[PDB]
Amino acid sequence: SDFLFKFLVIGSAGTGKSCLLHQFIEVEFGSRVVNVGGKTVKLQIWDTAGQERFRSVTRSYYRGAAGALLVYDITSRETYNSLAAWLTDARTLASPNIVVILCGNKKDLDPEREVTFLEASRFAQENELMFLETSALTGENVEEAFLKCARTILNKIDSGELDPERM
Ligand SMILES: Nc1nc2c(ncn2[C@@H]2O[C@H](COP(=O)(O)OP(=O)(O)O)[C@@H](O)[C@H]2O)c(=O)[nH]1
Ligand SMILES: [Mg+2]
Hints:
By secondary structure, the chain is of the alpha/beta class. It is built from seven helices and six strands. The two termini are 15 Å apart.
């Protein structure tokens, strides 16, 4: 493979993080080789193993990660309000250069929506994050979130924003 990246999927317990991973590959981790611009990027995506339901997430989970999905549940504002803390954790325990794509998950549960597309998209813009709404149940935008994250990493490598020899 031309690139090897450790990826996270972070956010509140119950937001669909493990289902996003399972949808993307098919669980402690998963790996999948994706083609971006004729280059194979091998992703090793670490699952939190439910630890965030019970305690702080171990810092060894974040360490060395190049990219992350930051996930909230569109039906739960409480998960949405938690995003800054997860993002700060990602940037402190992984690195300030982790590429993070915001995912409003459970898009298929639009009737019971509590977070608007537009307030979430403003959050992303304000925080230098790409944004998509996703469903792990149907699969809508799941592959694309992972692809967008990987694609952004390679663009920043290409433009000299990210030093690939330090990743
Ligand atoms: N309706 C719907 N349910 C989802 C979606 N993603 C996850 N879930 C459900 O939400 C619950 C928790 O998902 P899980 O992957 O374990 O979330 P995690 O704790 O953040 O890893 C499960 O009952 C899932 O089936 C989705 O996109 N739509
Ligand atoms: Mg999980």
